[PDB]
């Protein structure tokens, strides 16, 4: 984990996320939306289990991205919860929740759910 | 369960659902959207654990509603997964998934997640 987590990860939609896993569980980095142009970067912050494992389990982690930067404000935030599996073909398998700020009448429809698999390739 | 489940349930949004729990696990009934006018009814079908319990656990159940009837076609379906807790103040606590049919480009945003608590009052 940690050293294995630090780096660039790509998902099946063309998004790129670059993160540094700190010694004590911190996750810091940026998320880049497709196209890959400057203004597609958002800050991400999260945490991971720095002491995961005699039975080959994955490392639990999660991070959040608020979709606001100096070019866009999508008035929403997404959190990814999942685990890191290292090895020849390491991957981070996640499920995410994307919540948009709504008025109280639309609160019932404010959150979408999905899943993403990130690889180093 | 079963006899305790059969009846009318109301949620915190003003929706009403009337169901019959069959001896062998079937759940059949109708869901009515707010206002309460004719055209607000949709068919619901589901299943529940007909043999739940020496430790006061709830009864697991789930049901589905496709949002199409003879007045409306919202091209979506919702499934509610939860458990029935009977007693003085019985309730069905659920989490739901609402998926809309989308083109493949919007598939990533096709499902919303929420929760509902239904009571008999």
């Amino acid at each position: 984990a940690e050293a294995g987590i630090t780096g660039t990860w790509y998902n099946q939609l063309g998004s790129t996320f670059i993160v540094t896993a700190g010694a004590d569980g911190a996750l810091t980095g940026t998320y880049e939306s497709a196209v890959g142009n400057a203004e597609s970067r958002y800050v991400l912050t999260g945490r991971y289990d720095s002491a995961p494992a005699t039975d080959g389990s994955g490392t639990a982690l999660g991070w959040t991205v608020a979709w606001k930067n100096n070019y866009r404000n999508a008035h929403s935030a997404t959190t990814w919860s999942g685990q890191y599996v290292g090895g020849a073909e390491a991957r981070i398998n996640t499920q995410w929740l994307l919540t948009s700020g709504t008025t109280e009448a639309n609160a019932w429809k404010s959150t979408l759910v999905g899943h993403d698999t990130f690889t180093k390739v | 369960a079963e006899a305790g489940i059969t009846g009318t349930w109301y949620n915190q949004l003003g929706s009403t659902f009337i169901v019959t729990a069959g001896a062998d696990g079937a759940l059949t009934g109708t869901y009515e959207s707010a206002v309460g006018n004719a055209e607000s009814r949709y068919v619901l079908t589901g299943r529940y654990d007909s043999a739940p319990a020496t430790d006061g656990s709830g009864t697991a159940l789930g049901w589905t509603v496709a949002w199409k009837n003879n007045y409306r076609n919202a091209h979506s379906a919702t499934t509610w997964s939860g458990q029935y807790v009977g007693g003085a103040e019985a309730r069905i606590n659920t989490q739901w998934l609402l998926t809309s049919g989308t083109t493949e480009a919007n598939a990533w945003k096709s499902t919303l997640v929420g929760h509902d608590t239904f009571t008999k009052v």
């Binding site: 939609l13 063309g14 497709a34 196209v35 597609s40 999508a74 997404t78 994307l98 | -």
Partner: peptide, 8 residues
């Protein structure tokens, strides 16, 4: 939305 695929 910035979390989506390319729109292309």
């Amino acid at each position: 939305h910035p979390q989506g695929p390319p729109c292309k």
